[PDB]
Amino acid sequence: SPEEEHPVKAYGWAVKDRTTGILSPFKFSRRATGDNDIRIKILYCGICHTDLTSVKNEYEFLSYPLVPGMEIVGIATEVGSKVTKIKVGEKVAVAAYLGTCGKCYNCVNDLENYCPEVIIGYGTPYHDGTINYGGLSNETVVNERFVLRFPEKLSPAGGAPLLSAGITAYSAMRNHGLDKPGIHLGVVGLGGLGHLAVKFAKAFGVRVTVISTTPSKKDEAINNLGADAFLFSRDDKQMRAAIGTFDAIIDTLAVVHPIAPLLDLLRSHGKLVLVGAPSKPLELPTIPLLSGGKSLIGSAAGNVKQTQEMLDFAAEHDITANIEVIPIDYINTAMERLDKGDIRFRFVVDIENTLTPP
Amino acid sequence: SPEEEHPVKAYGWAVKDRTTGILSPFKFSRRATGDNDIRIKILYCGICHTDLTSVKNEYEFLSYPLVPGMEIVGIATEVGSKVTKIKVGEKVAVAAYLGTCGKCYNCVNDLENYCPEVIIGYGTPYHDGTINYGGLSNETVVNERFVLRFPEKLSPAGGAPLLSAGITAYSAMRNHGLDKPGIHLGVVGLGGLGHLAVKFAKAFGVRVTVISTTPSKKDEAINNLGADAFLFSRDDKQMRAAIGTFDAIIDTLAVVHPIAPLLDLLRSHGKLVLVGAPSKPLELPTIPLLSGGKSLIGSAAGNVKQTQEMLDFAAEHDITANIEVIPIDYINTAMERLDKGDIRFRFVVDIENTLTPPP
Ligand SMILES: C/C=C1/C[N@@H+]2CCc3c([nH]c4ccccc34)[C@@](COC(C)=O)(C(=O)OC)[C@H]1CC2
Ligand SMILES: C/C=C1/C[N@@H+]2CCc3c([nH]c4ccccc34)[C@@](COC(C)=O)(C(=O)OC)[C@H]1CC2
Ligand SMILES: [Zn+2]
Ligand SMILES: [Zn+2]
């Protein structure tokens, strides 16, 4: 029994029947506080496109009942005897993964988001063999290595999507030098990840073009986010005039799309950084890749030290997501709106004020 | 008309009918020596898989009659008034491309192989609008920037495949730091490009595993080429035992193949360098790419300063291709053997002694 598997009671919303994807009230339990654990009372949980893909039953390996949500901002209500960096009552946030092997090269050099055995935010077994429950719940318990200190100046709700969308965009750009004035960057897709890529790029001084198939988004892209230009990808005239003009492109789309027009936008030796995860494979245009000497680079989240640095950057430059704050019992309707793209640009669930037991 | 479009006569072998891919004797002409040109009497021409892909009619943009061959070693018989780096009588070699726009960033910075308007070795228009004829011919004339000095100590026939296979392997490794001892390198495919990547890596001190679908190649890979290990690609125990063990993999195959097993062989942040050009599309497994923070990097030939440097390295370290020297009128059978992989590891055509004028 989920309410009997562990000693401390907990509750949230869960997809009980994977074939419908409907979340409903759900009681379970969480492990006791180990020596290095932090109990977190959850304030806000962001909703990302991976949550939606999970509720659409598109990830076979996940276990159900599924409690998704992996953009958690909360309060530490309890720390184990060996926690010293975080005091009870502090505002904290959780990384988009919950553990690593602790022994490989990535873990030992604090690049642990690339551990081959990274434990994702929910739906798979933790080190103690039990399935992980995510942020659509009242409280969570996390090993202190994966708990960040949340800056006092950052809106807890507006900053919650920095914990997976923001860090993915921030890290991709920091690791590949796309954070310096003089770089011309393309951002493909203007959803949660894309709109945060535009904000971080502006704060670095990067010149940014948004590349989109939705012309109604030109106005938000230029006026709201500060993009230097808007490229309608279906307009062959604009596409040909941008050939060879980008140093890098950050591709955030969750659907299958052609890669070669994107490679033709790159100058020689430019990088196409892939951070979205389409559920179907893409075609590798070999001659454009070879002849331009171009690179396809994958990137996922960021390591926990980079995430702390990202949060402190976001607090100093007032970088938050554009959010709609929702009650938990709206989550099923939000999923539909997220599926249609009717959100500008992030849902954030107010857990503390709107979740109650089943 | 091919014989009348330029002032100097020439001859070789050509695919006249693109739908059969059969080469036959062919008379044409080549331009006069301009001020910056070098006329080259062709001694040897290497045959690569791209020649075969061209003769299989898989590249729409080529024009016919098609004279392929782009691994040319020769003797300078004539230089334009403004040539000084090359003397008549010198052994020379030609890069696998013939010109560039001359004005873009890649051009002005001696990275000209990545010029967006690079003129390839044959089958497309030159700066004067005429179709280029490749190395399966008696002489060629090339702008001096794309002519290399060929080392005296290097075998002209064993060194001919350095001009496209060798340079592609050398540059890919020099450009991405796969030339430093301590790197564990995978070489996928043990054909012309693959076997020169192994030699170049052993000469750099790099630990090299050959990844192959042909177990019969294990003895040649370990004993003749010097590979440190041989990984049979179809053996799941072996593939699973190598997961996460490679720093980089150079993928040399000319056919479609699954990409995700190769990405699993890479450690996190590892590089998969693509130098073969399969004619059908490849599938990109994003989840492994994303999960590992891994890279797919394309690379093509090398610049001409790098090609010269590759040649002097190959002379000082005795790096040559393992070749079968063939007469030109065997080229159609060689194409068949090349299609089946029945060659260890390069055909080189002896142009000077076996090519004669048609009829
Ligand atoms: C940063 C979150 C993304 C999301 N998507 C898809 C995959 C995925 C991840 N978490 C999930 C949880 C449930 C279902 C799917 C996923 C994750 C988590 O981030 C890290 C460093 O683990 C991932 O597994 O990358 C290895 C990230 C990749 C892109
Ligand atoms: C070095 C040769 C390869 C070959 N294949 C395929 C494509 C191609 C090139 N030459 C040909 C000539 C005839 C038909 C196809 C090709 C080339 C060479 O161009 C250079 C050296 O700059 C290429 O990149 O052409 C833009 C190389 C890429 C892989
Ligand atoms: Zn690890
Ligand atoms: Zn150029």
Short mmCIF file of C-alpha atoms and ligand atoms in Angstrom, two decimals, chain B residues 100-107 112 115-117, ligand 4:
data_model
loop_
_atom_site.label_atom_id
_atom_site.label_comp_id
_atom_site.label_asym_id
_atom_site.label_seq_id
_atom_site.Cartn_x
_atom_site.Cartn_y
_atom_site.Cartn_z
CA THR B 100 36.50 28.36 -53.14
CA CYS B 101 34.75 31.75 -53.27
CA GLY B 102 37.98 33.35 -52.04
CA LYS B 103 36.15 36.04 -50.02
CA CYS B 104 34.19 34.49 -47.08
CA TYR B 105 35.66 34.13 -43.58
CA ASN B 106 36.67 30.48 -44.08
CA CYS B 107 38.55 31.42 -47.22
CA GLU B 112 38.76 27.04 -46.98
CA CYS B 115 33.73 27.53 -47.64
CA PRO B 116 29.96 27.39 -48.41
CA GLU B 117 30.73 27.49 -52.13
ZN ZN C 4 34.57 31.08 -49.31
#
